[PDB]
């Protein structure tokens, strides 16, 4: 409703870097808000694509941003008569970024790993990896929970059980308020998907450069399964956190598995032990239900509600035709330990191939009326297919059915405007929460400032 579409701020990264692929707000220890931007195809020293991270201070004018440097060299360790290898070429550093406290976590889901032993090997695979930074102090750490030292032959003997070689950890990520890093790894367990969790403090206190393989005793990973419903489900394609069990001492995880059950799609809500509390099933095969998930209380009852995006949902048209437009589902959390039940509201895109629901961002209370609001991206929507972001306001019964505001992409065709969104943070400190929108196709980020309601 009251975002300002007239006076925007633009940040930019290098050509071809995909600057804006991921982003988040970051508070330094002095309470000053900045923007962390992932750019997964940024060139490294080797002249090859490795990815990179940028830390943009707030400036109405925008502009270029200081790099946030991470070690981009391949590592080799000859230990225990084995050879451990990391490969950072095309690792996609910055394919996801998240901030917690004074720490930034930037992930490289396609970082590769191998282990050689004489003529045998583990196989060169994308275990993925996460880089952690404390910008003010300069401290650095890494977290790569899916790395192993088991040889290929052993996996064959066990029918490829507990196979974490293709995890792509950091594909998605989120941090709990208590500082527990949670990584989605959709390739985990031979493409079932898995989650990996570890306190940020313990990652920092256990990490030493050069080791590559070390124990994090407090870490916790989800489990393999022999239920074919889960096969190739990409459980962990998206993740979020919230409160869904009535115990405020505990954080619950929301996990998207967009291809669960032969591409039906699913989203699950679990406790921090990965015990399932709810399962939401997709409505239509191949719609990618679970591509994106968002948690926020939209109807002002103090209970977190769930939003699920299915960007490839095909709406029924006249003459028994189907039109791919994308769809978003709202599930209101009931009072008590009851089941979420059917969707309370269905929001459906209008532009063919627009991919409405690709990203869903809590905005907090944008218009300051007592109900939290959301923004929904359609990266290829709008009358000209350049991309649109639609704002929906909360209300006592959930969300409004019609958007209060529509932001048209200020970039050229193919920018993927809205692929990434982040709201709910007041960056200019004017008392209204603001919205940042990534457009990696144009290597830029756009900031929309909220203003007093006209």
């Amino acid at each position, epitope marked *: 409703l009251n975002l300002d579409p007239v006076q925007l701020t633009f940040y930019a990264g290098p050509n071809g870097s995909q600057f804006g692929f991921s982003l988040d707000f970051h508070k330094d220890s002095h309470g000053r808000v900045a923007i962390v931007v992932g750019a997964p195809r940024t060139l490294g020293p080797s002249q090859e694509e490795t990815g990179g991270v940028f830390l943009c201070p707030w400036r109405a004018e925008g502009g270029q941003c200081p790099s946030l440097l991470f070690d981009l060299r391949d590592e080799t360790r000859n*230990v225990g*008569s084995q050879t451990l290898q990391t490969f950072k070429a095309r690792q996609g550093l910055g394919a996801s970024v998240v901030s917690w406290s004074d720490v930034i976590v930037a992930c490289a889901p396609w970082q590769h790993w191998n282990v050689l032993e004489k003529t045998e090997e583990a196989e060169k695979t994308p275990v993925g990896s996460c880089f952690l930074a404390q910008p003010e102090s300069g401290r650095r750490a890494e977290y790569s929970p899916c790395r192993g030292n088991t040889l290929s032959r052993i996996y064959v003997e066990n029918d490829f059980s507990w196979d974490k070689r293709y995890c792509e950890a950091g594909f998605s990520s989120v941090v709990t308020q208590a500082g527990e890093l949670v990584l989605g790894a959709p390739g985990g367990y031979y493409f079932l998907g898995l989650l990996a969790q570890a306190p940020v403090a313990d990652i920092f206190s256990s990490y030493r450069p050069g080791i590559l393989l070390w124990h994090v*005793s407090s870490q916790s990973l989800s489990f393999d399964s022999s239920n074919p419903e889960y096969f190739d489900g990409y459980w962990g394609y998206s993740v979020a956190v919230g409160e869904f069990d009535g115990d405020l001492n505990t954080t619950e995880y929301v996990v998207g598995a967009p291809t669960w059950s032969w591409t039906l799609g699913a989203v699950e809500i679990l406790d921090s032990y990965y015990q399932r509390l709810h399962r939401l099933r997709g409505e239509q095969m191949a719609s990618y239900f679970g591509h994106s998930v968002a948690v926020t209380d939209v109807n002002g009852d103090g209970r977190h509600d769930l939003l699920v995006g299915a960007p490839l949902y095909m709406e029924s048209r006249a003459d028994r035709k189907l039109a791919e437009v994308g769809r978003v589902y709202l599930f209101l959390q009931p009072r008590g330990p009851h089941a979420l039940g059917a969707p309370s509201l269905l929001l459906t895109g209008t532009q063919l191939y627009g991919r409405f629901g690709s990203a869903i961002a809590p905005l907090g209370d944008l218009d300051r009326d007592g109900y939290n609001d959301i923004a929904v991206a359609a990266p290829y929507g709008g009358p000209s297919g350049r991309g649109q972001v639609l704002v929906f306001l909360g209300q006592s019964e959930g969300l409004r059915s019609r958007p209060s505001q529509v932001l048209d992409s200020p970039f050229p065709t193919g920018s993927a405007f809205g692929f990434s969104l982040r709201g709910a943070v007041d960056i200019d400190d004017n008392g209204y929460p603001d919205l940042i929108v990534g457009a990696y196709g144009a290597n830029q980020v756009a900031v929309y400032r909220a203003q007093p309601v006209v």
Partner: antibody
């Protein structure tokens, strides 16, 4: 607190066998590699081998092949070192060891078990 | 097998002194070395892992260094508790192998 609690001193006659124990306390034995080490006053320290209690896979220094056998019992959070056909050469103190962070390191040690061979 | 040659086998030093213990390997082990302490009649305590990293809880007066095939353990300002046996261990290759040991003794 991570602690390796080993069994008591052993007195064994030549040619006999003996089985030493290493019980994990404050953690699960499946967490890391568990190594066994032999110490003598003159010859010093010698790595015997290791096991991954999670799967039972072992490694040995070929010098102890046929003499030492390492096993684990996750049910009782314990790792074992079996010495067979004992000679005076086997009189020594035996330690079990596990790493702290580094997968391959040798940081935490049990208090040691004395084995004395005599008829 | 890799041979670890530790020097010296013993040293007579004084409280408050700074002392360095060295270890030479028959081939490059790329910091894959640990340092161990054994007080009189006691068991072992880990000091260093991977060349330079203090085990959690180890006094700051201890430090490790080196590269290739040569490494050092250095104790700055000896405490009374530091008079003990020290050993290096390499785990670059199976079998793991140990140095011959160094005994710190009181000078008089």
């Amino acid at each position: 607190e991570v602690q390796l609690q080993q069994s008591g001193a052993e007195l064994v006659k030549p040619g006999a066998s003996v089985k030493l124990s290493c019980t994990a306390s404050g953690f699960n034995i499946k967490d890391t590699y568990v190594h066994w080490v032999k110490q003598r006053p003159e010859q010093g320290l010698e790595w015997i081998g290791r096991i991954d209690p999670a799967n039972g896979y072992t490694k040995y220094d070929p010098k102890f092949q046929g003499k030492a056998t390492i096993t684990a019992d996750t049910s009782s959070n314990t790792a074992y070192l079996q010495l067979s056909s004992l000679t005076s050469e086997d009189t020594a103190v035996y330690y079990c060891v596990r790493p702290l962070y580094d997968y391959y390191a040798m940081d935490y040690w049990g208090q040691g078990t004395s084995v004395t061979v005599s008829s | 097998d890799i041979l670890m040659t530790q020097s010296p086998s013993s040293m007579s030093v004084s409280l408050g002194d700074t002392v360095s213990i060295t270890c030479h390997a028959s081939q490059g082990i790329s910091s894959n070395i640990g340092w161990l302490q054994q007080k009189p009649g006691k068991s072992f305590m880990g000091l260093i892992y991977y060349g330079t990293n203090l085990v959690d809880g180890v006094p700051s007066r201890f430090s490790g260094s080196g590269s290739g095939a040569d490494y050092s353990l250095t104790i700055s300002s000896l405490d009374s508790e530091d008079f003990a046996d020290y050993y290096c261990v390499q785990y670059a290759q199976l079998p793991y192998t140990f140095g011959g040991g160094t005994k710190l003794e009181i000078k008089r």
